[PDB]
Amino acid sequence: TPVVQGSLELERVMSSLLDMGFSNAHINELLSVRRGASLQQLLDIISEFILLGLNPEPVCVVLKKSPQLLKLPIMQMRKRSSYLQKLGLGEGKLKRVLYCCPEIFTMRQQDINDTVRLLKEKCLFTVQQVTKILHSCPSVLREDLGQLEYKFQYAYFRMGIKHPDIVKSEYLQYSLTKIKQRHIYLERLGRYQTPDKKGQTQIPNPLLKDILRVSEAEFLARTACTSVEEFQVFKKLLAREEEES
Amino acid sequence: TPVVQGSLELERVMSSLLDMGFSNAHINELLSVRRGASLQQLLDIISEFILLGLNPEPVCVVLKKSPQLLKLPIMQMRKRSSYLQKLGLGEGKLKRVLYCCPEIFTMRQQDINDTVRLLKEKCLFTVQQVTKILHSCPSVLREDLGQLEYKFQYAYFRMGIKHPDIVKSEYLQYSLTKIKQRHIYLERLGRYQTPDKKGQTQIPNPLLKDILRVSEAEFLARTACTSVEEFQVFKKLLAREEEES
């Protein structure tokens, strides 16, 4: 009968998730989350994420935050899971990507190809670096190709940052405004020298993470060493400088 | 049964809209405003507006103000959605375009092109400037090609304004009457000098926004520095000067 089939599938599906490493608390979480999706559809999607190197705990995070991932037609989801694997986002590297950019399974693959193409041939990033860029700065997939090129150029030419330190610092996730604000302030304060020609400065510049990753309060207390009120005025002055060509 | 399938179909579109970003009573606003259109037509029209870079809140505003947008065919809407994306209007900056000019979709394809062609080849605006003109001044599509050319000529030749300052000040949104009224008053008062030949004046002229964007009261108090009664007479004198020849 149909009622008995559904109970045997639920048992098969519960048993498969227990074997995959899911807790009983997580299995109920996942069963409550599925907005009318099949039990097999819930399982086929979890299996793809497990095949992508994700553990059972992060799988519950991505699916609770983004339940629309269960609505994905599975065969197209597998085809995208394969595209992302050869792109280097396997071995659980897609954990950070799904949290910020869950659209990656819905996106057009030529739009993803355009972003990797811009980074590899126009910004001269190696394949290993492009994979790390996508892993740590998923926002670059949503970024315009022009804006993203200018943002890269600012680090390489204006700031004098070599390709590895751009990737390691996760520079491309931040806004050009935040980047310009903090870099130009330090430059004019004398706390940031542009390295040239051998990539050397008189005094070593602060680390990219201590400039961008850190809070405005921490940036001003430890790196810039100025008052808060002074930087607020600087932001207004710089905004006007940009507005006027 | 048919009654149960309609309730399950309604639950799918309501779930899809909740996953997109819409929340609480903003999902119910989309279904109540509908004037006999299909259920898929509501999601097909809204899906193109989210793809154009609009957020869920202004999508409820543009469709409540202009419900006729749901009556548009999806295939003809996609054609114009693609035309506007290459024109630079899409990818987010289309909030104040449809709010002020809701007849843009129903308009003739060639009448939009004639207005774009006039700006690029006859007024010598760059593609980036033309895109900014249409975003801030959507009323230029409703205007006549002759009136719009003369309005541009007035700024470039009569007032001596270079192409960037015309675009930045949002000059083309105002009426030629308002423009002539305020420019000629200041010119005859001696508070506006025409720049030539190097684009320089003895004293710098007031800013285009302080002339046009500002209220009649503020224009007269800060820029023109005359009484209200005096400008009312000026408007009547100038109206008569225009009427003759």
Coordinates of C-alpha atoms in Angstrom, one line a residue:
Chain A
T1 CA 0.0 0.0 0.0
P2 CA 1.1 3.7 -0.3
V3 CA 1.2 4.4 3.5
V4 CA 3.6 1.4 4.1
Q5 CA 5.9 2.4 1.2
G6 CA 6.3 5.9 2.6
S7 CA 7.2 4.4 6.1
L8 CA 9.8 2.1 4.5
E9 CA 11.3 5.0 2.4
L10 CA 11.4 7.2 5.6
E11 CA 13.2 4.3 7.4
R12 CA 15.7 3.8 4.4
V13 CA 16.2 7.6 4.3
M14 CA 16.7 7.9 8.1
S15 CA 19.1 4.9 8.0
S16 CA 21.1 6.4 5.2
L17 CA 21.5 9.7 7.0
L18 CA 22.5 7.9 10.3
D19 CA 25.2 6.0 8.3
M20 CA 26.4 9.3 6.7
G21 CA 27.1 10.6 10.2
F22 CA 23.9 12.7 10.9
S23 CA 22.6 12.8 14.5
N24 CA 18.9 12.1 15.3
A25 CA 18.5 15.8 16.3
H26 CA 19.8 16.8 12.8
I27 CA 17.6 14.3 11.0
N28 CA 14.5 15.8 12.6
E29 CA 15.9 19.3 11.7
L30 CA 16.3 18.3 8.1
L31 CA 12.9 16.6 7.9
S32 CA 11.1 19.8 9.3
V33 CA 13.1 22.1 6.9
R34 CA 12.0 20.4 3.6
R35 CA 9.2 22.7 2.4
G36 CA 7.2 19.9 0.7
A37 CA 10.2 18.3 -1.0
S38 CA 10.5 14.5 -1.3
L39 CA 12.3 12.3 1.2
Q40 CA 14.5 11.1 -1.7
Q41 CA 15.0 14.7 -2.9
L42 CA 16.2 15.6 0.6
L43 CA 18.5 12.6 0.6
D44 CA 19.8 13.1 -3.0
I45 CA 20.8 16.6 -2.1
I46 CA 22.5 15.7 1.2
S47 CA 24.4 13.0 -0.6
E48 CA 25.8 15.5 -3.2
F49 CA 27.0 17.8 -0.4
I50 CA 28.5 14.8 1.4
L51 CA 30.2 13.9 -2.0
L52 CA 31.5 17.5 -2.1
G53 CA 33.5 16.9 1.1
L54 CA 31.1 18.6 3.5
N55 CA 30.6 17.0 7.0
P56 CA 27.1 16.4 8.4
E57 CA 27.1 19.5 10.7
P58 CA 27.9 22.1 8.0
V59 CA 25.3 20.4 5.7
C60 CA 22.6 21.3 8.3
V61 CA 23.8 24.9 8.5
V62 CA 23.7 25.5 4.7
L63 CA 20.3 23.8 4.3
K64 CA 18.7 25.6 7.3
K65 CA 19.9 29.0 6.1
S66 CA 19.2 28.2 2.5
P67 CA 16.3 25.6 2.3
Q68 CA 15.7 26.5 -1.4
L69 CA 18.7 24.1 -2.1
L70 CA 16.3 21.1 -1.7
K71 CA 14.1 22.5 -4.5
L72 CA 17.0 22.2 -7.0
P73 CA 16.3 19.6 -9.8
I74 CA 18.8 16.9 -8.8
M75 CA 20.3 16.0 -12.1
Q76 CA 21.1 19.7 -12.9
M77 CA 22.4 20.0 -9.2
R78 CA 24.8 17.0 -9.9
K79 CA 26.0 18.6 -13.1
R80 CA 26.8 21.8 -11.2
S81 CA 28.3 19.8 -8.3
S82 CA 30.6 18.3 -11.0
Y83 CA 31.5 21.8 -12.5
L84 CA 32.4 23.1 -9.0
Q85 CA 34.5 20.0 -8.2
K86 CA 36.8 20.4 -11.4
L87 CA 36.9 24.2 -10.5
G88 CA 38.6 23.1 -7.2
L89 CA 35.7 23.7 -4.8
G90 CA 35.6 20.1 -3.6
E91 CA 37.0 18.7 -0.3
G92 CA 34.5 20.8 1.7
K93 CA 35.8 24.1 0.3
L94 CA 32.2 25.0 -0.8
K95 CA 31.1 25.5 2.9
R96 CA 32.0 29.2 2.9
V97 CA 30.6 29.6 -0.6
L98 CA 27.1 28.3 0.2
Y99 CA 26.8 30.5 3.4
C100 CA 27.5 33.8 1.5
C101 CA 26.6 32.8 -2.1
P102 CA 23.9 30.0 -2.1
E103 CA 23.0 31.4 -5.6
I104 CA 26.0 29.4 -7.0
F105 CA 23.8 26.3 -7.7
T106 CA 21.2 28.6 -9.5
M107 CA 23.7 30.8 -11.4
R108 CA 24.5 30.5 -15.1
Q109 CA 27.8 28.6 -15.5
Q110 CA 29.0 31.0 -18.3
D111 CA 28.6 33.9 -15.7
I112 CA 30.8 31.8 -13.3
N113 CA 33.2 31.0 -16.3
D114 CA 33.4 34.8 -17.1
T115 CA 34.6 35.5 -13.5
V116 CA 37.2 32.8 -13.5
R117 CA 38.3 33.9 -17.0
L118 CA 38.7 37.5 -15.9
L119 CA 40.8 36.5 -12.9
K120 CA 43.0 33.9 -14.7
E121 CA 43.8 35.7 -18.0
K122 CA 43.2 39.4 -17.2
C123 CA 44.3 39.6 -13.5
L124 CA 47.0 36.8 -14.1
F125 CA 45.9 34.6 -11.1
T126 CA 47.0 30.9 -11.2
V127 CA 44.3 28.2 -11.1
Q128 CA 45.1 27.4 -7.4
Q129 CA 44.7 31.1 -6.5
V130 CA 41.4 31.5 -8.4
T131 CA 40.1 28.5 -6.5
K132 CA 41.1 30.1 -3.1
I133 CA 39.6 33.4 -4.3
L134 CA 36.2 31.7 -4.9
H135 CA 36.5 29.8 -1.6
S136 CA 37.3 32.9 0.6
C137 CA 35.7 35.7 -1.5
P138 CA 32.5 34.2 -3.0
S139 CA 31.1 37.8 -3.5
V140 CA 33.4 38.1 -6.6
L141 CA 30.8 35.9 -8.5
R142 CA 28.1 38.6 -7.9
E143 CA 30.6 41.4 -8.7
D144 CA 30.7 43.3 -12.1
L145 CA 33.6 42.3 -14.3
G146 CA 34.8 45.9 -14.6
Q147 CA 34.5 46.8 -10.9
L148 CA 36.3 43.5 -10.1
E149 CA 39.1 44.2 -12.6
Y150 CA 39.6 47.8 -11.2
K151 CA 39.5 46.4 -7.6
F152 CA 42.3 44.0 -8.5
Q153 CA 44.3 46.7 -10.3
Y154 CA 44.1 48.9 -7.2
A155 CA 45.9 46.2 -5.1
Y156 CA 48.5 45.3 -7.8
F157 CA 49.4 48.8 -9.2
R158 CA 48.1 51.5 -6.7
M159 CA 48.9 49.5 -3.4
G160 CA 51.7 47.3 -4.8
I161 CA 50.4 43.9 -3.6
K162 CA 51.7 40.7 -5.3
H163 CA 49.1 38.1 -6.4
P164 CA 49.7 35.7 -3.4
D165 CA 49.2 38.3 -0.7
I166 CA 46.0 39.5 -2.4
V167 CA 44.6 36.0 -2.3
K168 CA 45.9 35.1 1.3
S169 CA 44.4 38.3 2.8
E170 CA 40.9 37.8 1.1
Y171 CA 41.2 41.3 -0.3
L172 CA 38.6 40.9 -3.0
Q173 CA 35.6 40.4 -0.5
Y174 CA 35.8 44.1 0.6
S175 CA 34.3 47.2 -1.1
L176 CA 36.5 49.5 -3.1
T177 CA 35.2 52.3 -1.0
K178 CA 36.3 50.6 2.3
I179 CA 39.7 49.8 0.6
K180 CA 40.2 53.3 -0.7
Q181 CA 39.2 54.9 2.6
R182 CA 41.6 52.9 4.7
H183 CA 44.5 52.7 2.2
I184 CA 44.5 56.4 1.3
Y185 CA 44.2 57.5 5.0
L186 CA 47.2 55.4 6.0
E187 CA 49.1 56.6 2.8
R188 CA 48.5 60.3 3.7
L189 CA 49.3 59.6 7.4
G190 CA 52.6 58.1 6.2
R191 CA 51.8 54.7 7.7
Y192 CA 51.5 53.0 4.3
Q193 CA 54.3 53.3 1.7
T194 CA 53.7 52.0 -1.9
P195 CA 56.4 49.3 -2.5
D196 CA 58.6 49.9 -5.6
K197 CA 60.5 48.6 -7.7
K198 CA 61.8 45.5 -5.8
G199 CA 58.6 45.2 -3.6
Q200 CA 60.4 46.9 -0.7
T201 CA 59.6 49.9 1.6
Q202 CA 61.5 51.9 4.2
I203 CA 59.3 50.7 7.0
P204 CA 57.1 47.5 6.5
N205 CA 53.5 48.4 5.9
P206 CA 50.7 47.0 8.2
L207 CA 49.3 43.6 7.2
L208 CA 46.3 43.7 4.8
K209 CA 44.1 41.9 7.5
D210 CA 45.0 44.6 10.1
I211 CA 43.9 47.2 7.5
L212 CA 40.7 45.7 6.0
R213 CA 39.5 42.6 8.0
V214 CA 39.6 44.4 11.4
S215 CA 36.9 46.8 12.7
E216 CA 37.0 50.6 12.2
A217 CA 37.6 51.1 15.9
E218 CA 40.5 48.5 15.9
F219 CA 41.9 49.9 12.6
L220 CA 42.0 53.4 14.1
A221 CA 43.4 52.3 17.5
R222 CA 46.2 50.0 16.4
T223 CA 47.0 50.6 12.7
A224 CA 46.1 54.3 11.8
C225 CA 46.5 55.6 15.4
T226 CA 44.0 58.5 15.1
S227 CA 40.8 59.6 16.7
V228 CA 37.4 58.4 15.4
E229 CA 36.1 62.0 14.7
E230 CA 39.2 62.7 12.5
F231 CA 38.5 59.6 10.3
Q232 CA 34.8 60.6 9.9
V233 CA 35.9 63.9 8.4
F234 CA 38.5 62.1 6.2
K235 CA 35.7 59.8 4.8
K236 CA 33.7 63.0 3.9
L237 CA 36.7 64.7 2.3
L238 CA 37.6 61.6 0.3
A239 CA 34.0 61.1 -0.8
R240 CA 34.0 64.6 -2.3
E241 CA 37.5 64.1 -3.9
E242 CA 36.1 61.0 -5.7
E243 CA 32.8 62.8 -6.8
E244 CA 34.9 65.5 -8.5
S245 CA 36.5 63.3 -11.3
Chain B
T1 CA -9.2 17.1 -6.6
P2 CA -8.9 20.6 -8.3
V3 CA -9.5 22.5 -5.0
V4 CA -6.5 20.7 -3.3
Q5 CA -4.2 21.3 -6.3
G6 CA -4.9 25.1 -6.3
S7 CA -4.0 25.2 -2.5
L8 CA -0.7 23.2 -3.1
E9 CA 0.1 25.5 -6.1
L10 CA -0.6 28.6 -4.0
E11 CA 1.7 27.2 -1.2
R12 CA 4.6 26.7 -3.8
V13 CA 4.5 30.3 -5.1
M14 CA 4.1 31.7 -1.5
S15 CA 7.1 29.5 -0.5
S16 CA 9.1 30.7 -3.5
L17 CA 8.4 34.4 -2.7
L18 CA 9.3 33.8 1.0
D19 CA 12.6 32.2 -0.1
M20 CA 13.3 35.2 -2.5
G21 CA 13.1 37.8 0.3
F22 CA 9.4 38.9 0.8
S23 CA 8.1 38.5 4.4
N24 CA 5.0 38.6 6.6
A25 CA 2.1 40.6 4.9
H26 CA 4.2 41.7 1.9
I27 CA 3.6 38.3 0.1
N28 CA -0.3 38.8 0.5
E29 CA 0.0 42.3 -1.1
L30 CA 1.1 40.7 -4.4
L31 CA -1.9 38.3 -4.6
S32 CA -4.6 40.9 -3.4
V33 CA -3.6 43.7 -5.9
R34 CA -4.0 41.2 -8.9
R35 CA -6.8 42.2 -11.3
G36 CA -7.7 38.9 -13.0
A37 CA -4.1 38.0 -14.2
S38 CA -2.8 34.4 -14.0
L39 CA -0.9 33.0 -10.9
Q40 CA 2.2 32.2 -13.0
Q41 CA 2.0 35.6 -14.7
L42 CA 2.4 37.3 -11.3
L43 CA 5.6 35.2 -10.6
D44 CA 6.9 35.6 -14.2
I45 CA 6.7 39.4 -14.0
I46 CA 8.1 39.6 -10.4
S47 CA 10.9 37.1 -11.4
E48 CA 12.1 39.4 -14.2
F49 CA 12.1 42.4 -11.7
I50 CA 14.3 40.5 -9.2
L51 CA 16.6 39.5 -12.2
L52 CA 16.8 43.2 -13.1
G53 CA 18.4 44.0 -9.6
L54 CA 15.3 45.2 -7.7
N55 CA 14.8 44.2 -4.1
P56 CA 11.5 42.7 -2.7
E57 CA 10.4 46.0 -1.1
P58 CA 10.4 48.3 -4.2
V59 CA 8.8 45.4 -6.3
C60 CA 5.7 45.8 -4.0
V61 CA 5.8 49.6 -4.6
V62 CA 6.1 49.6 -8.4
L63 CA 3.4 46.9 -8.9
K64 CA 0.9 48.6 -6.4
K65 CA 1.3 52.0 -8.1
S66 CA 1.4 50.5 -11.6
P67 CA -0.7 47.2 -11.6
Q68 CA -0.9 47.3 -15.4
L69 CA 2.7 45.8 -15.4
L70 CA 1.1 42.3 -14.6
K71 CA -1.0 42.6 -17.9
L72 CA 2.2 42.7 -20.0
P73 CA 3.1 39.4 -22.0
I74 CA 6.1 37.6 -20.5
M75 CA 7.8 37.1 -23.9
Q76 CA 7.5 40.9 -24.8
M77 CA 8.6 41.9 -21.3
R78 CA 11.8 39.7 -21.5
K79 CA 12.6 41.4 -24.9
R80 CA 12.4 44.9 -23.3
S81 CA 14.2 43.6 -20.1
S82 CA 17.1 42.5 -22.3
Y83 CA 17.1 45.8 -24.3
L84 CA 17.3 47.8 -21.0
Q85 CA 20.1 45.5 -19.6
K86 CA 22.4 46.3 -22.6
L87 CA 21.3 50.0 -22.4
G88 CA 22.8 50.0 -18.9
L89 CA 19.5 50.6 -17.0
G90 CA 19.3 47.1 -15.5
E91 CA 21.5 45.5 -12.8
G92 CA 19.9 47.5 -9.9
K93 CA 19.4 51.2 -11.0
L94 CA 15.7 51.0 -12.2
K95 CA 13.8 52.1 -9.0
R96 CA 13.1 55.7 -9.9
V97 CA 12.7 54.9 -13.6
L98 CA 9.4 52.8 -13.4
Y99 CA 8.1 54.8 -10.4
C100 CA 8.1 58.1 -12.4
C101 CA 7.8 56.6 -15.9
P102 CA 5.6 53.4 -15.8
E103 CA 4.8 53.6 -19.6
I104 CA 8.4 52.6 -20.5
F105 CA 7.4 48.9 -21.3
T106 CA 4.3 49.7 -23.5
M107 CA 6.4 52.4 -25.4
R108 CA 7.6 51.7 -29.0
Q109 CA 11.1 50.2 -29.3
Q110 CA 12.2 52.7 -32.0
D111 CA 10.9 55.8 -30.1
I112 CA 13.2 54.8 -27.1
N113 CA 16.1 54.2 -29.6
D114 CA 15.5 57.6 -31.4
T115 CA 15.8 59.4 -27.9
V116 CA 19.1 57.4 -27.1
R117 CA 20.5 58.0 -30.6
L118 CA 19.8 61.7 -30.3
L119 CA 21.8 61.9 -27.0
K120 CA 24.8 59.9 -28.2
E121 CA 25.3 61.1 -31.8
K122 CA 23.6 64.6 -31.9
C123 CA 24.3 65.8 -28.3
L124 CA 27.7 63.9 -28.1
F125 CA 27.0 62.2 -24.7
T126 CA 29.1 59.1 -24.0
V127 CA 27.3 55.7 -23.4
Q128 CA 28.0 55.9 -19.6
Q129 CA 26.5 59.5 -19.5
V130 CA 23.4 58.5 -21.6
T131 CA 22.8 55.6 -19.1
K132 CA 23.0 58.1 -16.2
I133 CA 20.6 60.6 -18.0
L134 CA 17.9 57.9 -18.4
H135 CA 18.2 56.7 -14.7
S136 CA 17.8 60.2 -13.1
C137 CA 15.7 61.9 -15.9
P138 CA 13.2 59.2 -17.2
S139 CA 10.9 62.1 -18.4
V140 CA 13.2 62.6 -21.5
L141 CA 11.5 59.5 -23.2
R142 CA 8.1 61.3 -23.0
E143 CA 9.7 64.5 -24.5
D144 CA 9.9 65.4 -28.2
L145 CA 13.2 64.8 -30.0
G146 CA 13.4 68.5 -31.0
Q147 CA 12.5 69.9 -27.6
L148 CA 15.1 67.6 -26.0
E149 CA 17.8 68.6 -28.5
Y150 CA 17.1 72.4 -27.9
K151 CA 17.1 71.8 -24.1
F152 CA 20.6 70.3 -24.4
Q153 CA 21.8 73.1 -26.8
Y154 CA 20.6 75.7 -24.2
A155 CA 23.0 74.2 -21.6
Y156 CA 26.0 73.6 -24.0
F157 CA 25.9 76.8 -26.1
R158 CA 23.7 79.4 -24.3
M159 CA 24.7 78.6 -20.7
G160 CA 28.1 77.1 -21.5
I161 CA 27.9 73.8 -19.5
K162 CA 30.2 70.9 -20.4
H163 CA 28.6 67.4 -20.9
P164 CA 29.7 66.0 -17.4
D165 CA 28.1 68.9 -15.4
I166 CA 24.9 68.6 -17.4
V167 CA 24.6 64.9 -16.5
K168 CA 25.8 65.3 -12.8
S169 CA 23.3 68.1 -12.1
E170 CA 20.3 66.2 -13.6
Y171 CA 19.6 69.2 -15.8
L172 CA 17.4 67.4 -18.4
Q173 CA 14.6 66.6 -15.9
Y174 CA 13.6 70.3 -15.6
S175 CA 11.3 72.2 -18.0
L176 CA 12.9 74.6 -20.5
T177 CA 10.6 77.3 -19.1
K178 CA 12.0 76.8 -15.5
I179 CA 15.5 76.7 -17.0
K180 CA 15.0 79.9 -19.1
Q181 CA 13.3 81.7 -16.2
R182 CA 16.1 81.1 -13.6
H183 CA 19.1 81.3 -16.0
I184 CA 18.0 84.6 -17.8
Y185 CA 17.0 86.2 -14.5
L186 CA 20.5 85.6 -13.0
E187 CA 22.1 86.5 -16.3
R188 CA 20.3 89.9 -16.4
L189 CA 20.9 90.4 -12.6
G190 CA 24.7 89.9 -13.4
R191 CA 24.8 86.8 -11.1
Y192 CA 25.4 84.4 -14.1
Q193 CA 28.2 85.0 -16.6
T194 CA 28.4 82.9 -19.8
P195 CA 31.8 81.1 -19.9
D196 CA 34.1 81.7 -23.0
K197 CA 36.4 80.9 -24.7
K198 CA 38.4 78.8 -22.2
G199 CA 35.2 78.0 -20.1
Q200 CA 36.1 80.6 -17.5
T201 CA 34.2 83.5 -15.9
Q202 CA 35.3 86.6 -13.8
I203 CA 33.4 85.3 -10.8
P204 CA 32.3 81.5 -10.6
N205 CA 28.6 81.1 -11.4
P206 CA 26.3 79.4 -8.8
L207 CA 26.0 75.6 -9.0
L208 CA 23.3 74.1 -11.3
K209 CA 21.6 72.4 -8.4
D210 CA 21.4 75.8 -6.4
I211 CA 19.7 77.3 -9.6
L212 CA 17.3 74.5 -10.7
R213 CA 17.0 71.7 -8.0
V214 CA 16.3 74.2 -5.2
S215 CA 12.9 75.8 -4.4
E216 CA 11.8 79.1 -5.9
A217 CA 12.0 80.7 -2.3
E218 CA 15.5 79.3 -1.7
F219 CA 16.6 80.3 -5.3
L220 CA 15.5 83.9 -4.6
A221 CA 16.9 84.0 -1.1
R222 CA 20.3 82.5 -1.6
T223 CA 21.2 82.6 -5.3
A224 CA 19.2 85.5 -7.1
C225 CA 18.9 87.6 -3.9
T226 CA 15.7 89.4 -4.9
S227 CA 12.1 89.7 -3.7
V228 CA 9.4 87.2 -4.6
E229 CA 7.1 89.9 -6.1
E230 CA 10.0 91.1 -8.5
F231 CA 10.5 87.6 -9.9
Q232 CA 6.7 87.1 -10.5
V233 CA 6.8 90.2 -12.8
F234 CA 10.0 88.8 -14.4
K235 CA 8.2 85.6 -15.2
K236 CA 5.4 87.5 -16.9
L237 CA 7.8 89.8 -18.8
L238 CA 9.9 86.8 -20.1
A239 CA 6.7 84.8 -21.0
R240 CA 5.7 87.8 -23.3
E241 CA 9.2 88.1 -24.7
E242 CA 9.1 84.4 -25.7
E243 CA 5.5 84.7 -27.2
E244 CA 6.7 87.3 -29.7
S245 CA 8.9 85.6 -32.3

